Design a protein around this nucleic acid. Structure first.
Lengths: 63, 46, 77, 93, 102
RNA sequence: UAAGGUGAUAUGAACCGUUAUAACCGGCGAUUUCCGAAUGGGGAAACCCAGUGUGUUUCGACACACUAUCAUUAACUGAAUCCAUAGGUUAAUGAGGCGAACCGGGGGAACUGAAACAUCUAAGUACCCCGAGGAAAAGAAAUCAACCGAGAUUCCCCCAGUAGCGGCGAGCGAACGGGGAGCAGCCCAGAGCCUGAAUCAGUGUGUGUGUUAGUGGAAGCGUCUGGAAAGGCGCGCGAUACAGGGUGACAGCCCCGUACACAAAAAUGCACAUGCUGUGAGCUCGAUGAGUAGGGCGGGACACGUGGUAUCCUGUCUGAAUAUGGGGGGACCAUCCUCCAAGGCUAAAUACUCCUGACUGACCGAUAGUGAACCAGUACCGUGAGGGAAAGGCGAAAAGAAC
RNA sequence: GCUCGCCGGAAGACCAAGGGUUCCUGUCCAACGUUAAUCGGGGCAGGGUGAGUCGACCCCUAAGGCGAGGCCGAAAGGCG
RNA sequence: UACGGUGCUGAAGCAACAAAUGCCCUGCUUCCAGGAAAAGCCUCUAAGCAUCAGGUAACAUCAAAUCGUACCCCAAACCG
């Protein structure tokens, strides 16, 4: 699709479960037990994005 | 004096224990009547 | 239970009725003796569980559907 | 090389406790809260793959949450797993 | 749909002093509405020993059952109707009388 | 489908939306821990421990994948053993455990009645054991029927309390046939002609209309008592809409609703046409259900209980015929009528509620109604199977009581 | 505190199965506890028991239990 | 420190006698009731292999999980 086909490809998104866990989750790990993480959506906005790929790896993007 | 209850889990968990009750004709039926009664536990050993 | 494999012969309903006139049960069964024989489709002699007259059914009745029905019930020969 | 990290989520609290501020004469080892997700087989070699720390010795302990909560019903306070990790000086986490 | 929606003036048939009206602030999935100037209850509250409490009267807008509240007609000091019927599609309020869907 | 929301105890804290990732509802899927069929291998309920591969680096090891047995069938292999069989190693398909009823078969009482008991009653009833499907089971006459005729089966009502059985006691008790509901019938022991012809099943589409994720729907104002009315007073209005609930002492007109109407990627009930796919009509000749139909002994199920006794079945011995034959028809025989057994399938008119939705009760309204109208099969009792509660209702409203 | 009386092969101290935070400290007054409670083993808020070697498991076996193939029993189920 | 202990450092640290419920001792004598098994363990050999693996001796060196560990304990923390 138009711009979603530019420079992003299925074989790069295959590693998203690593790049989410070792970056986006790591920057939130134990910070609620440090008193630095009070905003209750900052984890919620980085949930689901890996599950979306882990689903799209077997489910198709249309009818 | 001596009570008829003398506590030990090795003996009580092979006695009224779930694992052989779940592997014997009439023990399987206690579990089915307890699912029908709606008990929170089927076991009595914990 | 003791049953005949070629005829499907099962236990029967029946009473004492002599000394006394009573409907008392006695448990009535076919008497097993077996037969060791040949069917030409199996590359072997076969021993099969049979009772009285059951060997005389094998003598002159077609059995290939029963040999398949035993196998459809998973029963061994 | 040094195991796969596709599942790596070590540590759950930097932790605050009185056994680190009323009996801790040497910085040797520091106490942590790690939950039922950690073991001394792992926290000795895996923590270095996520955090910039150095570790030579560790201990682990089950630590039950005593008994009972506010009722409602008896419930639990929950078991929280205690760990002790090498530090030797200053602050590491 | 709530006929009074969320920021309309409601004539409030309740209370003693009928010459007053209120304005909506929130609506619940229950038969309840939160309305400013509904009953003017001052309420002191039983005080707490620890932590800073604002104290004194709260003067806060209270709840009312949705049956007691209709919109202020802005013409004769009476209640009015809004309507939700539109034969081309989805609901719209039109004072049950307007030539336009507002 | 919408302009508001992010479960409950439940506050507290923090955000997410107006247009597609706010919230969420329907469908079809993805993902689906450990124990439990529970199954790689083990276990004393959520624990313990392997096998075989793939990949890769700095190779004191992770990541990912596959794996009970049994049965059917095949492959590969392979003992005594030559051919072969088990055993050995895999693969494809199948059972296994579960909520409810309906429902198929098996094992099967005692209580009670005979005003004591023993065949009989009670009763194939309970309890138990196995188990399948949208229904299960029934099924296409070696059948009834009585010389007239009917032409698979099931359900409903009659038939009936009629016949028949009964220590002829106490009692038991059809079936044929009639009325209605309902209306598919066929195949193999063979295969030539015929050719997809009959008759149904699976699935798509359209038409008509319900259901499903949805929710718009006419009229009331003033004044009076009172804390406050919808009551009371005065006068109107909608009504193919006055059901009921809620709303501050009697609401059609305050709110929800009601009547009514709109609501569809796709699925479905019911009516009706039709595209596709499967089964596959019709003609003729040939064949045809044997260790069984019976018989004997000893019994069973049939309403029938050794009777003058039939049918159907059979533990067990014996065993005959093919239309120039054989069966049944209340002993038995003769006559006569009527069928074609010992081979195989099957439609729904019937039954029921785990579960989805709807309508009805001079139904209960808290010593009632279900063990419970409230985190109730919870608290709790017992070694255990098992057993097991208590508290409904402030007021219009937290307005929940400062000082 | 001081003084008194008692046990001392226990009325001392340690432990397996037993139960599982009842330990250590502060605090509570409401319910409980054979009187009264200022006290708690009952309540509330805090603090804490780190292991190759010691326990159990990983490994082995008795009495016994279960069990593919093989057998018995309507069947469930039972042997082995 | 005008005080809760502090926590560095240290003298004597030898001999007889009586006896195990302890050790040599899963020793000896004696009796007749002759008083578990298997694995780990030690050896022999098959297979497997010398690209080694394994063994003996010596030096270095990694982890060793899993669950336990508080407390009452002959008791107001086990049962009445």
């Amino acid at each position: 699709m138009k711009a979603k086909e530019l420079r992003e490809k299925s074989v790069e998104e295959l590693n998203t479960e690593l790049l989410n866990l070792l970056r986006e989750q790591f920057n939130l790990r134990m910070q609620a037990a440090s008193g630095q993480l009070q905003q209750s959506h900052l984890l919620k906005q980085v949930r689901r994005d890996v599950a979306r790929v882990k689903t799209l790896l077997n489910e198709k993007a249309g009818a | 004096m001596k009570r008829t209850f003398q506590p030990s889990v090795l003996k009580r968990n092979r006695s009224h224990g779930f694992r052989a009750r779940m592997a014997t004709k009439n023990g399987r039926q206690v579990l089915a009547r307890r699912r029908a009664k709606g008990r929170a536990r089927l076991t009595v050993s914990k | 239970s003791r049953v005949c494999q070629v005829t499907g012969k099962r236990p029967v309903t029946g009473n004492n009725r002599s000394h006394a006139l009573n409907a008392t049960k006695r448990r009535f069964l076919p008497n097993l003796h077996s037969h060791r024989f040949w069917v030409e489709s199996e590359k072997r002699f076969v021993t099969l569980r049979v009772s009285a007259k059951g060997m005389r059914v094998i003598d002159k009745k077609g059995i290939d559907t029963v040999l398949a029905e035993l196998r459809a019930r998973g029963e061994k020969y | 090389m040094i195991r796969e990290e596709r599942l790596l989520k070590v540590l759950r609290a930097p932790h605050v406790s009185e056994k680190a501020s009323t009996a801790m004469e040497k910085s040797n080892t520091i106490v942590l809260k790690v939950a039922k997700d950690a073991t001394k087989a792992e926290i000795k070699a895996a923590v270095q793959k996520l955090f910039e720390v150095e570790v030579e010795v560790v201990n682990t302990l089950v630590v039950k949450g005593k008994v009972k909560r506010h009722g409602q019903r008896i419930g639990r306070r929950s078991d929280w797993k205690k760990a002790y990790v090498t530090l030797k000086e200053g602050q590491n986490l | 749909a709530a006929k009074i929606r969320r920021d309309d003036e409601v004539i409030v048939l309740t209370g003693k002093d009928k010459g007053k009206r209120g304005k909506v602030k929130n609506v619940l999935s229950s038969g309840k509405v939160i309305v400013e100037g509904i009953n003017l209850v001052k309420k002191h509250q039983k005080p707490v020993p620890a932590l800073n409490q604002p104290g004194g009267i709260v003067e806060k807008e209270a709840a009312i059952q949705v049956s007691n509240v209709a919109i202020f007609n802005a013409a004769t000091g009476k209640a009015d109707r809004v309507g939700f019927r539109f034969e081309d599609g989805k609901k719209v309020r039109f004072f049950k009388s307007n030539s336009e869907t507002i």
